Amino acid sequence: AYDTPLGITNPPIDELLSRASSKYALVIYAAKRARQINDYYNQLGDGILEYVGPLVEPGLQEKPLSIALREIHGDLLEHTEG
Amino acid sequence: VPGAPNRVSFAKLREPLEVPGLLDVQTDSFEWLVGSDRWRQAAIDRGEENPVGGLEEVLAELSPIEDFSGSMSLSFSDPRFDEVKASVDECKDKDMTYAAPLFVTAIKSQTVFMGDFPMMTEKGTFIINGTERVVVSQLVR
Amino acid sequence: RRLRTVGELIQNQIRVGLSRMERVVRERMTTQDVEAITPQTLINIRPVVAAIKEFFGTSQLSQFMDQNNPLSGLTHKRRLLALGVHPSHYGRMCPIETPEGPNIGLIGSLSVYARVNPFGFIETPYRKVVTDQIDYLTADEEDRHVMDVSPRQMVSVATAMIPFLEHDDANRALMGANMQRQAVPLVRSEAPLVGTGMELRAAIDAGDVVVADKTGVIEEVSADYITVMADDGTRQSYRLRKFARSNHGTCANQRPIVDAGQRVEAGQVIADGPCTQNGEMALGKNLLVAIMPWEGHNYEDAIILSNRLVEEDVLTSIHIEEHEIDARDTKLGAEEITRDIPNVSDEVLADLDERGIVRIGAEVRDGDILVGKVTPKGETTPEERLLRAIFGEKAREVRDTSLKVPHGESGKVIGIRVFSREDDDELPAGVNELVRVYVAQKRKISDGDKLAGRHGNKGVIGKILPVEDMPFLPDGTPVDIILNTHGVPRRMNIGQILETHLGWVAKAGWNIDVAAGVPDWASKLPEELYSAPADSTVATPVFDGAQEGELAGLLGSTLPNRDGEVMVDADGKSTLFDGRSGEPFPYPVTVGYMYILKLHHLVDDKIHARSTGPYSMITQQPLGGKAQFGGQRFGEMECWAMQAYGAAYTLQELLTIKSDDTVGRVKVYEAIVKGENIPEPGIPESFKVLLKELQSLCLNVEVLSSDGAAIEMR
Amino acid sequence: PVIPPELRPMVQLDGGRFATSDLNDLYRRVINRNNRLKRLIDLGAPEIIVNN
Ligand SMILES: CC(=O)O[C@H]1[C@H](C)[C@H](O)[C@H](C)[C@@H](O)[C@@H]([C@H](C)OC(=O)C(C)(C)CC(=O)O)CC/C=C(/C)C(=O)Nc2cc(O)c3c4c(c(C)c(O)c3c2O)O[C@](C)(O/C=C/[C@H](O[C@H]2C[C@@H]3OCO[C@@H]3[C@@H](C)O2)[C@H]1C)C4=O
């Protein structure tokens, strides 16, 4: 159902909450990954650190925070909860 | 009203007494204060025969101020007015205040000046520093 | 009821100025020997002139006059402060026009017929019972109390102008009074179609209308002035206020209503004021209304309007704002106002004249310079001097200080007043030049503007529909506004519906078509009320006005339109066609003409947006309330909601780098421009100021980490 | 201790007027009397004036 999510509401938070423990863990999850993607796109980030991404097919002008949400939705990355 | 438009009234009754000048609340007081000759026409259909002015009443109750050691004749009476310095348009344009200078005309008898005394316009307003002001009325017991 | 009147409360302030002046004449006459003393030399009039100067300037009773319409200024006068309900309040001072704010009960307006006794007592007029003589009623007349003078004794002017006042609730009646004194003058100034009899009497006495002093005939009629040739032979002339900026910025414009050949009697209206038409208050327009809810665009308070109102400038109003700038007597020397700006393009000053002031008639948008001005320099960067020397520009001092237009406003320049030092004029000490620029705006009605009627109803403009798609009568005549019904079954505001039907009765006329007498609903009616043509104004006094029976009788009589079809039934409803789908609306919808107003709250003034701007000196937080870029306040209540969501970062961003981080808000604007990650916030300046405030209180505070015992912010 | 000046500023207002915090007058109240006390002690003034 929910014929098709539009913009911010995609992906649904229900299908996202299965990838992490809490909604708060979801925030730090996608937020730090957005920092990694936006780094990679500008250029290599901090001292002696090579940053990767994006893993999923990027959108036309898709923001780095919207990409990281699609990455978590597909289980393309795991985090250490706590 | 002579030039009043035609407006059909659903009221079957009659109001004999026309509304008094709603602006008279401001004008009648300031005319009583300065002691205008128009308020002096209130003695034409007279009441109490004496038209004592507000400034005169304040000046008369204090007059004379008697020094304790020796008597001093400081009695003040018959205050004088001068025509208003400038028009309301000039006072609002030049940012000055609409006022008429007032000097008291009263043991030496040397007439003394007091200061610029603000005046009320026909609309019942005061121009104080180029701004049109209205003095509300206060209700105490 | 003391009722301190202006002159009487003026005199009381003169007492203090004279008494404190006499205290000096007692003391300073003793030290100096006699025969060197006169009432003149010893009396210093400063305490007397200071008291009156201190009264109008500092007194709460001396108020900045409120005039966006003649009624507001008329009701600002006659207002009274009650700080020191009952039977004595009836007929003396109505609690009906008390403000809706927390000051309710302390502030009220004088009744219509109230007269003031010389001692301060409020005298109500009445007729002893029904004797024809009118005597002053008061507490003295309350001892022997037996007939009132007239209805609406307890009703003020603002309240007496609401048709069908008896039907609405006291709250809605109160709000209606405040809504009327909030109206803005429209360029057209169309008179109300249905109303009371107070429009005429309140307009002329407001003072903003041109009244004839003596009977005569007009000699000349021009937009500038009007001359009247009296039979007595004397010559009177009246200069008309033309686009004069009011106290609150509403255009005060006077229109001559007479022609040269006309013969005018004394007391007649020669020209209309800003909000008057033909000598009676016109605070709004007459519009065709539909009370059907229309696809949620009029949801809950919102109102939908036809694009016709934007095209025909019916709700358009002129707004004028004054800007000022001054000259020398500065810190490091006297600055000069000049056209020359330090470094700008020739096209930026293209609209500036030889002096550097914006030329009249020119259009100005956000950021454009009005008055060019320079300041004395510090004359004390290396990287800027190099480019200066390379291309030849010089460190000509200077700091650019120009009066630009405030962000978010635009218009045309109507006039400039300049006060220079060369001419001898009066100005403050050291200030050489003073120039004031007046800019006018023709404001179209726009979505978001607040409209209201005389019954207290109010609401923003939800949407402006093109004239093509609107519920329209079978005539093809679209409705101007579309109201909603759901307000009634809690607040009930019945009067709003009554004038809506009478508005249609007056627009289309009527003829009772008497056959074998007159109907029973016309029993209490006069004969002149029958058979009126279209577009006829109507007067319904508050308590002696129309009644429900006569209304429906008029609803049954409707002069058809051009083709002879009847557009409204006896129920005041009609079958409207949806301008979008074309299908007719399944049920008959109530239509009519209601008198609505344009309130002073406008979208152009109430919209604010800020990305970066100036910051306060003591506290490094942003500062709103200046000519540009006001910042929004994030209170603790908002901080409580932000914590309830559990959003720690969002709360930290608002309170540190968006508000108080000295090095934070600059590095974020830098990172955003480069497109980098946003850095971690620092220490808010509010907290650093907190520590110093503690140290100045002799409290030794120390911020200790896990190690390195004490750290100093610096 | 004396609070830094930027937290108790004195700056020129619009139209040429001056503005300042109250702390400057309250600090001025203290330093004025503390100094006059030094003058009284060095003057050998009576104890009534000094203790006052
Ligand atoms: C700058 C100024 O002069 O403001 C004036 C006054 C507001 C202006 O006349 C203003 C133009 C006003 O006429 C219009 C305005 C549009 O209305 C509104 O602002 C709102 C938005 C609320 C209305 C609305 O849109 O809903 C329309 C007003 C219509 C109504 C039913 C109304 O408001 N009634 C009203 C409201 C009041 O609050 C007070 C009030 C007050 C006294 C003694 C009053 O009688 C008040 C009063 O009758 O005592 C207080 C504590 O303080 C007093 C403060 C000020 O007096 C000065 C007088 C001296 O001038 C300089 O030094 C003095 C200075 C220190 O105080 C007040 C009296 C105070 O709160």
Curated annotation (Swiss-Prot), chain A:
GO-annotated biological processes: DNA-templated transcription
EC number: 2.7.7.6
Cystine bridges: none
UniProt catalytic activity: RNA(n) + a ribonucleoside 5'-triphosphate = RNA(n+1) + diphosphate
First-tier enzyme category under EC: transferase
Alphabetic keyword roster: DNA-directed RNA polymerase, Nucleotidyltransferase, Transcription, Transferase
Protein family (similarity comment): Belongs to the RNA polymerase subunit omega family.
Name of the protein described by the UniProt record: DNA-directed RNA polymerase subunit omega
Organism expressing this protein natively: Mycolicibacterium smegmatis (strain ATCC 700084 / mc(2)155) (Mycobacterium smegmatis)
From Swiss-Prot, chain B:
Function per UniProt: DNA-dependent RNA polymerase catalyzes the transcription of DNA into RNA using the four ribonucleoside triphosphates as substrates. This subunit often mutates to generate rifampicin (Rif) resistance. Interaction with RbpA partially restores Rif-inhibited transcription; once the subunit is Rif-resistant however RbpA no longer stimulates transcription.
Assigned protein family: Belongs to the RNA polymerase beta chain family.
Protein name as annotated: DNA-directed RNA polymerase subunit beta
Note: Mutations in the RRDR sequence (residues 423-449) confer rifampicin (Rif) resistance. Rif blocks transcription initiation but not elongation.
Coiled coil location: none
Section of the entire sequence shown: 23 to 172 of 1169
Subunit structure as annotated in this protein's UniProt entry: The RNAP catalytic core consists of 2 alpha, 1 beta, 1 beta' and 1 omega subunit. When a sigma factor is associated with the core the holoenzyme is formed, which can initiate transcription. Interacts with RbpA, which partially restores Rif-inhibited transcription.
From Swiss-Prot, chain D:
Endpoints of the signal sequence: none
Superkingdom per UniProt: Bacteria
Family: Belongs to the RNA polymerase beta' chain family.
Subunit-level organization: The RNAP catalytic core consists of 2 alpha, 1 beta, 1 beta' and 1 omega subunit. When a sigma factor is associated with the core the holoenzyme is formed, which can initiate transcription.
Protein function: DNA-dependent RNA polymerase catalyzes the transcription of DNA into RNA using the four ribonucleoside triphosphates as substrates.
Protein's recorded name: DNA-directed RNA polymerase subunit beta'
Organism annotation: Mycolicibacterium smegmatis (strain ATCC 700084 / mc(2)155)
Gene that produces this protein: rpoC
Residues of the full protein shown: 318 to 369 of 1317
